[PDB]
Structure formats: C-alpha cells, structure tokens
Enzyme design. Structure first.
Site, PDB file in Angstrom:
ATOM      1  N   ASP A 223       9.510  -2.873  91.034  1.00  0.00           N
ATOM      2  CA  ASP A 223       8.767  -1.725  90.524  1.00  0.00           C
ATOM      3  C   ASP A 223       9.481  -1.116  89.322  1.00  0.00           C
ATOM      4  OD1 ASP A 223       6.772   0.127  90.302  1.00  0.00           O
ATOM      5  OD2 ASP A 223       7.377   1.337  92.030  1.00  0.00           O
TER       6      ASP A 223
ATOM      7  N   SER B   2       7.232   9.563  90.889  1.00  0.00           N
ATOM      8  CA  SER B   2       7.324   8.131  90.637  1.00  0.00           C
ATOM      9  C   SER B   2       7.631   7.804  89.182  1.00  0.00           C
ATOM     10  CB  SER B   2       6.012   7.442  91.034  1.00  0.00           C
ATOM     11  OG  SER B   2       5.849   7.420  92.438  1.00  0.00           O
ATOM     12  N   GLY B   3       8.523   6.837  88.985  1.00  0.00           N
ATOM     13  CA  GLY B   3       8.899   6.422  87.645  1.00  0.00           C
ATOM     14  C   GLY B   3       9.999   7.299  87.079  1.00  0.00           C
TER      15      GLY B   3
ATOM     16  N   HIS C 262       4.332   0.457  88.848  1.00  0.00           N
ATOM     17  CA  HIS C 262       3.125   0.943  89.503  1.00  0.00           C
ATOM     18  C   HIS C 262       2.460   2.129  88.816  1.00  0.00           C
ATOM     19  CE1 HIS C 262       5.518   4.088  91.771  1.00  0.00           C
ATOM     20  NE2 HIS C 262       4.376   4.736  91.627  1.00  0.00           N
TER      21      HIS C 262
HETATM   22  C1  LIG Z   1      -0.286   4.560  97.128  1.00  0.00           C
HETATM   23  C2  LIG Z   1      -0.209   3.078  97.543  1.00  0.00           C
HETATM   24  O1  LIG Z   1      -0.188   2.982  98.986  1.00  0.00           O
HETATM   25  C3  LIG Z   1      -0.368   1.687  99.473  1.00  0.00           C
HETATM   26  O2  LIG Z   1      -0.531   0.708  98.723  1.00  0.00           O
HETATM   27  C4  LIG Z   1      -0.364   1.455 101.001  1.00  0.00           C
HETATM   28  O3  LIG Z   1       0.877   1.915 101.562  1.00  0.00           O
HETATM   29  N1  LIG Z   1       1.915   0.853 101.438  1.00  0.00           N
HETATM   30  C5  LIG Z   1       3.205   1.104 101.363  1.00  0.00           C
HETATM   31  C6  LIG Z   1       4.161  -0.131 101.179  1.00  0.00           C
HETATM   32  C7  LIG Z   1       5.553   0.011 100.791  1.00  0.00           C
HETATM   33  C8  LIG Z   1       6.366  -1.171 100.625  1.00  0.00           C
HETATM   34  C9  LIG Z   1       5.833  -2.496 100.835  1.00  0.00           C
HETATM   35  C10 LIG Z   1       4.458  -2.643 101.216  1.00  0.00           C
HETATM   36  N2  LIG Z   1       3.638  -1.461 101.382  1.00  0.00           N
HETATM   37  C11 LIG Z   1       3.775   2.600 101.371  1.00  0.00           C
HETATM   38  C12 LIG Z   1       3.561   3.256  99.907  1.00  0.00           C
HETATM   39  C13 LIG Z   1       3.616   2.396  98.707  1.00  0.00           C
HETATM   40  C14 LIG Z   1       3.617   2.914  97.383  1.00  0.00           C
HETATM   41  C15 LIG Z   1       3.562   4.365  97.179  1.00  0.00           C
HETATM   42  C16 LIG Z   1       3.502   5.264  98.345  1.00  0.00           C
HETATM   43  C17 LIG Z   1       3.497   4.719  99.704  1.00  0.00           C
HETATM   44  N3  LIG Z   1       3.463   6.571  97.939  1.00  0.00           N
HETATM   45  C18 LIG Z   1       3.500   6.399  96.549  1.00  0.00           C
HETATM   46  C19 LIG Z   1       3.493   7.682  95.675  1.00  0.00           C
HETATM   47  N4  LIG Z   1       4.853   8.157  95.242  1.00  0.00           N
HETATM   48  C20 LIG Z   1       6.011   8.535  96.053  1.00  0.00           C
HETATM   49  C21 LIG Z   1       5.878   9.086  97.399  1.00  0.00           C
HETATM   50  C22 LIG Z   1       7.037   9.451  98.152  1.00  0.00           C
HETATM   51  C23 LIG Z   1       8.395   9.290  97.614  1.00  0.00           C
HETATM   52  C24 LIG Z   1       9.523   9.673  98.374  1.00  0.00           C
HETATM   53  N5  LIG Z   1       9.463  10.144  99.614  1.00  0.00           N
HETATM   54  N6  LIG Z   1      10.768   9.709  97.930  1.00  0.00           N
HETATM   55  C25 LIG Z   1       8.503   8.724  96.245  1.00  0.00           C
HETATM   56  C26 LIG Z   1       7.329   8.355  95.484  1.00  0.00           C
HETATM   57  N7  LIG Z   1       3.559   5.097  95.983  1.00  0.00           N
HETATM   58  C27 LIG Z   1       3.614   4.627  94.552  1.00  0.00           C
HETATM   59  C28 LIG Z   1       3.267   3.320 102.632  1.00  0.00           C
HETATM   60  C29 LIG Z   1       4.756   3.318 102.313  1.00  0.00           C
END
Ligand SMILES: CCOC(=O)CO/N=C(/c1ccccn1)C1(c2ccc3c(c2)nc(CNc2ccc(C(=N)N)cc2)n3C)CC1
Ligand SMILES: [Ca+2]
Lengths: 235, 55
Positions: free
Chosen positions: A88, A185-186, A42
């Site tokens: 991912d 991330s990553g 991602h």
């Molecule tokens: C930023 C993208 O957000 C979306 O596409 C909509 O939210 N959709 C999801 C989702 C997860 C699994 C399956 C389906 N949909 C999510 C989601 C998905 C991908 C995400 C995210 C949040 N936040 C990030 C940014 N990085 C991140 C944030 C928090 C972390 C942690 N707490 N350890 C570790 C990494 N990325 C990269 C709400 C929980």
C-alpha cells in the site's frame, strides 16, 4: 486521529493533504522533497482527480500559508491489491515545486539498515492527519498528531484478523483510545532521532479505530526505500 | 572497550555505518557531514526532518 493533540505551528510541516474536486481532504501524504509526495496506493481510488495541499493546519479558515499543487505523475506500486492491502504505497510528482516555509518542509528518508536497527527499534513514532477523530464521525478540520508505540510483530499478527505482511507494521495502543483513523490514510508516520524526523510509515488500515485489542497498521517504508528512490527519478 | 554504531548510534547525528570495523557517519539529502565527521549540518533554511518552530 483519535485522541492525540493538535499539531501546533511548525510541528508537522511534512504533512500533505490530498484534496478532491470539491477541494475536500480525503487522505494524507508526506512531503519528501520539493517535487515528491509519499502516500498510500489505496488513496488513489478515493477520487478520480485530486490535488495536493501543503501547509494547511485548519481546513476551515484559509490563512494564506496553504499552497495547492497539481499532480504531474502518479506512481502506484504495481503489486498493491485490495485483497490483502499489501504494497500500500504510492509516490506523486507535482507539476510545480513546493516552497518550503513555516509549516511546509520535507521529512527525511532514512537508509534501510539504519532505519531498521535505529528507528524501528525506538519505543514510539508519531502519526498525523486530518482524519476522523472518532471511528464514527466527520474528518478533522484541524491537523492532529499522535505518539504511537511500535508494536512487536508477534502481538501484531495475533491481534489481527487479517494477514500482516512484512511490508506492514503495527503501532498504537492495545486499550488506550488513541489511533489513526479513516482519512489519515496515506499520511505520515515519522520517527524522531536526535531532533530529526524520518518517515517510517504510511497510514494504511486498521480494524475500526482505537478498537480494544487492535492496532493501527502501517506500510513499512524501509521495505520500499529502493522503490521510492527509484520512483523519485522517473520510473 | 570496543563497540560502534550499536553504541549511542556511534555518536553520529544521523546514519551510522560500520566500515572496515570503524564508525562512518552520513547524512540525509539536504545536510552535509560536519568536519568532526559526526554532525549533520543543514544546507538550507528548511532541511528535512526539522520542525519549523519559532516560539
Ligand atoms: C475500506 C475497505 O474495506 C475492505 O476492503 C474490507 O475490509 N478488509 C480489510 C482487510 C485488511 C487486510 C487484508 C484484507 N482485508 C480491513 C480494512 C482494509 C482497508 C481499510 C480499512 C479496513 N479501513 C480503511 C480506512 N482507513 C484507516 C482506518 C483505521 C486506521 C487505524 N486504526 N489506524 C488507519 C486507516 N482502509 C483503507 C477490515 C480491516
Ligand atoms: Ca487553513
């Protein structure tokens, strides 16, 4: 990284930082060898073109220890999808070899079965990165590390609003305000065993950061060892 | 008393595999299996998985 501590000199040498056109870090990575970097699929969308910086600990003042490397080949898992964020993972081949030194060294890739029975069963792992230090904030200018407990898959799935595949694992605290965050991330999730650190995960996602009743979600490296080995040989 | 990789990682520094019913230790790239067949010796100054500390 919310909470945790600053990586002191030489403590997190396998940490890589993906930097955009403006030379700003937007994601982490893990050094696997002189030519390869492990990161999250991602993260490849966070920038059109990007380079890899190693040896950095403080994005503010360049201290000469840093080194920038161009990417020659980007190998993204064909199954990754933002719909589920499953698969991912990505591997980058650099144009020039990394020069290992103080603060610059690869993390070990473990063997699948051994990793699952010996590493994944450990009480904790370590995640690091230059990501946000608070759910709402700017990216850390200093590299931080955080000890995170492995979370049993059962609690993991129940706590998550989204599907946790077998290619993912949970780590972190239920209530304690420590966790990885946006920007990490990553990055590396490594597990220590007899003073040797093995890459066990890739910071992937989470519902907010350090949020109560929620954990950090990571790509399970053991699930892609064959894929990684395969990618590190042109394929 | 009989037990292998499940017992203190078979006394292996790194990878432990049970072949024939015996412990067989191995190491990641950048290391060589020591003569005692258990320890992993770094081949260079910056072996994988080692923090680069000095003080
Ligand atoms: C930023 C993208 O957000 C979306 O596409 C909509 O939210 N959709 C999801 C989702 C997860 C699994 C399956 C389906 N949909 C999510 C989601 C998905 C991908 C995400 C995210 C949040 N936040 C990030 C940014 N990085 C991140 C944030 C928090 C972390 C942690 N707490 N350890 C570790 C990494 N990325 C990269 C709400 C929980
Ligand atoms: Ca610097």
């Amino acid at each position: 990284i919310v909470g945790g501590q600053e990586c002191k000199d030489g403590e997190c040498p396998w940490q890589a930082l993906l930097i955009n056109e403006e030379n700003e870090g937007f994601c982490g990575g893990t050094i696997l060898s002189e030519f390869y970097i492990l990161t999250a699929a991602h993260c490849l969308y966070q920038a059109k073109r990007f380079k890899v910086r190693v040896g950095d600990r403080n994005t503010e003042q360049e201290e000469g220890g840093e080194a920038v490397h161009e990417v020659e080949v980007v190998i993204k898992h064909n199954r990754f999808t933002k719909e589920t964020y499953d698969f991912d993972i990505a591997v980058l081949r650099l144009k020039t070899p990394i020069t290992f030194r103080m603060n610059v060294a690869p993390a070990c890739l473990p063997e699948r079965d051994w990793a699952e029975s010996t590493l994944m069963t450990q009480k904790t792992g370590i995640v690091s990165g230059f990501g946000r230090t608070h759910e709402k904030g700017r990216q850390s200018t200093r590299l931080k590390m955080l000890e995170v407990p492995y979370v049993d898959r059962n609690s993991c799935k129940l706590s998550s609003s989204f599907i946790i595949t077998q290619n993912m694992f949970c780590a972190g605290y239920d209530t304690k305000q420590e966790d990885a965050c946006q920007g990490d991330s990553g990055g590396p999730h490594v597990t220590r065993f007899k003073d040797t650190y093995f890459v066990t995960g890739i910071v992937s996602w989470g519902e907010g950061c350090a949020r109560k009743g929620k954990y950090g979600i990571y790509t399970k490296v053991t699930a892609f060892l064959k894929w990684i080995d395969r990618s590190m040989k042109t394929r | 008393t009989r037990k292998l990789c499940s017992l203190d990682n078979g006394d292996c520094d790194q990878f432990c595999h049970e072949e024939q019913n015996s412990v067989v230790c191995s190491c990641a790239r950048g290391y060589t299996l020591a003569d005692n067949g258990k320890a992993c010796i770094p081949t260079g100054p910056y072996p994988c998985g080692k923090q680069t500390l000095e003080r």
